[PDB]
Design an enzyme around this catalytic site. Structure first.
Site, PDB file in Angstrom:
ATOM      1  N   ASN C  44       0.869  -1.267  -0.106  1.00 29.64           N
ATOM      2  CA  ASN C  44       0.062   0.018   0.165  1.00 29.64           C
ATOM      3  C   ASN C  44       0.760   1.322   0.069  1.00 29.64           C
ATOM      4  OD1 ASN C  44       0.471  -0.775   2.749  1.00 29.64           O
ATOM      5  ND2 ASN C  44      -1.261   0.253   3.468  1.00 29.64           N
ATOM      6  N   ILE C  45       0.455   2.307  -0.439  1.00 27.68           N
ATOM      7  CA  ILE C  45       1.055   3.504  -0.681  1.00 27.68           C
ATOM      8  C   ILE C  45      -0.125   4.684  -0.622  1.00 27.68           C
ATOM      9  CG2 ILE C  45       2.301   5.272  -2.402  1.00 27.68           C
ATOM     10  CD1 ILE C  45       3.176   2.387  -4.022  1.00 27.68           C
ATOM     11  N   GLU C  46       0.050   5.232   0.498  1.00 29.16           N
ATOM     12  CA  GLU C  46      -0.991   6.231   1.028  1.00 29.16           C
ATOM     13  C   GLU C  46      -0.770   7.542   0.444  1.00 29.16           C
ATOM     14  OE1 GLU C  46      -1.476   5.535   5.238  1.00 29.16           O
ATOM     15  OE2 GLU C  46      -2.575   3.906   4.841  1.00 29.16           O
ATOM     16  N   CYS C  55      -4.033   0.343  -2.601  1.00 30.44           N
ATOM     17  CA  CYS C  55      -3.513  -0.921  -2.153  1.00 30.44           C
ATOM     18  C   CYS C  55      -2.693  -1.658  -2.494  1.00 30.44           C
ATOM     19  CB  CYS C  55      -4.971  -1.534  -2.143  1.00 30.44           C
ATOM     20  SG  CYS C  55      -6.356  -0.816  -1.254  1.00 30.44           S
ATOM     21  N   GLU C  57      -2.633  -5.002  -3.488  1.00 28.77           N
ATOM     22  CA  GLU C  57      -2.933  -5.896  -4.355  1.00 28.77           C
ATOM     23  C   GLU C  57      -3.047  -5.325  -5.620  1.00 28.77           C
ATOM     24  OE1 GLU C  57      -6.348  -6.308  -1.281  1.00 28.77           O
ATOM     25  OE2 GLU C  57      -4.258  -5.353  -1.400  1.00 28.77           O
ATOM     26  N   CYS C  89      -9.853  -5.477  -0.085  1.00 27.97           N
ATOM     27  CA  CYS C  89     -11.298  -4.381  -0.157  1.00 27.97           C
ATOM     28  C   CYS C  89     -11.834  -4.789  -1.504  1.00 27.97           C
ATOM     29  CB  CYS C  89     -10.809  -3.097   0.003  1.00 27.97           C
ATOM     30  SG  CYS C  89      -9.930  -2.369  -1.691  1.00 27.97           S
TER      31      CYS C  89
HETATM   32  O1  LIG Z   1      -3.686  -2.412   0.845  1.00 29.24           O
HETATM   33  C1  LIG Z   1      -4.762  -2.720   1.237  1.00 29.24           C
HETATM   34  N1  LIG Z   1      -5.178  -3.807   0.710  1.00 29.24           N
HETATM   35  C2  LIG Z   1      -6.695  -4.013   1.067  1.00 29.24           C
HETATM   36  O2  LIG Z   1      -7.092  -4.265   0.006  1.00 29.24           O
HETATM   37  C3  LIG Z   1      -7.240  -3.065   1.825  1.00 29.24           C
HETATM   38  C4  LIG Z   1      -6.502  -2.415   2.878  1.00 29.24           C
HETATM   39  N2  LIG Z   1      -5.055  -2.144   2.434  1.00 29.24           N
HETATM   40  C5  LIG Z   1      -4.701  -0.664   2.614  1.00 29.24           C
HETATM   41  O3  LIG Z   1      -4.660  -0.748   4.100  1.00 29.24           O
HETATM   42  C6  LIG Z   1      -4.655   0.613   4.707  1.00 29.24           C
HETATM   43  C7  LIG Z   1      -6.028   1.030   5.451  1.00 29.24           C
HETATM   44  O4  LIG Z   1      -7.169   0.922   4.671  1.00 29.24           O
HETATM   45  C8  LIG Z   1      -4.675   1.596   3.290  1.00 29.24           C
HETATM   46  O5  LIG Z   1      -3.383   2.126   3.041  1.00 29.24           O
HETATM   47  C9  LIG Z   1      -5.266   0.586   2.184  1.00 29.24           C
HETATM   48  O6  LIG Z   1      -5.103   0.942   1.128  1.00 29.24           O
HETATM   49 ZN   LIG Z   2      -7.646  -2.794  -1.603  1.00 25.34          ZN
END
Ligand SMILES: O=C1N[C@H](O)CCN1[C@@H]1O[C@H](CO)[C@@H](O)[C@H]1O
Ligand SMILES: [Zn+2]
Ligand SMILES: O=C1N[C@H](O)CCN1[C@@H]1O[C@H](CO)[C@@H](O)[C@H]1O
Ligand SMILES: O=C1N[C@H](O)CCN1[C@@H]1O[C@H](CO)[C@@H](O)[C@H]1O
Ligand SMILES: O=C1N[C@H](O)CCN1[C@@H]1O[C@H](CO)[C@@H](O)[C@H]1O
Ligand SMILES: [Zn+2]
Ligand SMILES: [Zn+2]
Ligand SMILES: [Zn+2]
Lengths: 134, 134, 136, 136
Positions: C44-46, C55, C57, C89
């Site tokens: 993940n890269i916020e 996310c 994936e 998600c």
């Molecule tokens: O990478 C993820 N994969 C799943 O599909 C959902 C959750 N995430 C990541 O988790 C952090 C909190 O939502 C976020 O940074 C979010 O993108």
């Molecule tokens: Zn996701």
């Protein structure tokens, strides 16, 4: 409730008229029923940059929340696609799930036929608020 | 934009902020937009347990307006709880704004009612837009 | 476990180290296995503007596609949650589905235990290319 | 043009070939140059659900970050549009800004001509990480 179901299904169909979708030419309407019987509707709203569009279901949910409603009983979705019931995309399912799993999703065809599944059934073993709790 | 419309926008944005759904950031944002015919639509940020699935206040407001048949926008005001910074629209919000024109006004406010106003064009110069796909 | 599962689990756990998640402090890694045996990692890269994050994936899938790989066999997901399997998600499920319904998602815990579900199972009655009449 | 510019422009053009864009039929390539000289390529990757697409620039940035690179010098963007320099959308500008405002964006045409602006110039008075800092 049959009164609410019919109003909801018609509201979703009517909402479709407002769709801003010059890129896909694929209009989508949605209507959400709250715990106290209020209906909020929405439509897809596209952007020249495709990723910046929003779906009908999220337009409706976002409208409801902005007006102080977070208790949802059902959501109905309508499109012009004749051959299949219009199903929510995964992003819409995840937004629905933020506000519970037990509520009903009406997936319709233009002819008025539909199938119903709960948010839980549409998004099994879901990621959710619980992941970030504690 | 008349000082009266600006005040209405400021109050609408601050009021909308009260409905923000932001348990993850605890960073509430409100927005209010003014249409050509003088109607105001407001919105707030609405977050998701999966961070990418949230939506900004500006987009909640714009999406609400479009869903009700309004695509002619004069101004949008944004409010937050940041005391020391004017609240500025993120780039995604700027892009959604731009879908509906470049010449209109963005009021970036502080809690005390002071603000900086810039056009969509000024905030998103040399923009990508519908013309890229013509 | 089978060799490819061992690979998926280790690569996904390693991928988590690169997470950019200063806002949630919730790191996620993903490892995507292609038909020809190549693994693409992601995390993940916020973004300060929360909706502009991505996310793990999707980082992994987007990496694979950008390098010309579209035949996916499995993807494993890793998080710091010791007591929950990390589940994709809905947005990640929809991106997975663009590239098929008949591939495996490994939802793991740090102890190396996991639950496997197909994309079809995770996204029943999926919206997809057929909605825009793109399958012809 | 300087060697690093030649590399950016060519890599961005080449990246366009990998675009997954059956909905828009509008391919976009991007090439991201890191401080140490490595280039990461990206392309747009669309979804039947239009909002679930990703842009070239973000594909490239996300790849770089996933591999531990956060020091960006420049990014070049390529498209098939002859009449206009291809410019990054606002979302891409915001992701760029997460990793600094002082670096260069090369907005090109297929003929190899370009305009260069900084992230700061493309996203003035930006929302960013500072908005979310605990101590103000
Ligand atoms: O990478 C993820 N994969 C799943 O599909 C959902 C959750 N995430 C990541 O988790 C952090 C909190 O939502 C976020 O940074 C979010 O993108
Ligand atoms: Zn996701
Ligand atoms: O509104 C929708 N709801 C469903 O969840 C998925 C599909 N859509 C919308 O349909 C168009 C084509 O993807 C897009 O504009 C898209 O946002
Ligand atoms: O509503 C917003 N308007 C500006 O464009 C950017 C910031 N936000 C919102 O603030 C929270 C933190 O990123 C998020 O919930 C985010 O969506
Ligand atoms: O990759 C891009 N870079 C720019 O920032 C904006 C435009 N795009 C991509 O072009 C297609 C049409 O919007 C979409 O696939 C879209 O994501
Ligand atoms: Zn959707
Ligand atoms: Zn925003
Ligand atoms: Zn973009």
């Amino acid at each position: 409730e049959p009164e609410h179901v019919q109003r909801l299904l018609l509201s979703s169909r009517e909402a479709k008229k407002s769709a801003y979708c010059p890129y896909s030419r694929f209009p989508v309407g949605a209507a959400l029923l709250t715990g106290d019987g209020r209906i909020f509707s929405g439509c897809n709203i596209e952007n020249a940059c495709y990723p910046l569009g929003v779906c009908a279901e999220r337009t409706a949910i976002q409208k409801a929340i902005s007006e102080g409603y977070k208790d949802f009983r059902a959501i109905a979705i309508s499109s012009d696609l004749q051959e299949e019931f219009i199903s929510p995309c995964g992003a819409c399912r995840q937004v629905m799930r933020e506000f519970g799993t037990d509520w009903a999703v009406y997936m319709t065809k233009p002819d008025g036929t539909f199938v119903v599944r709960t948010v839980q059934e549409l998004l099994p073993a879901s990621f959710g608020p619980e992941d970030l709790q504690k």
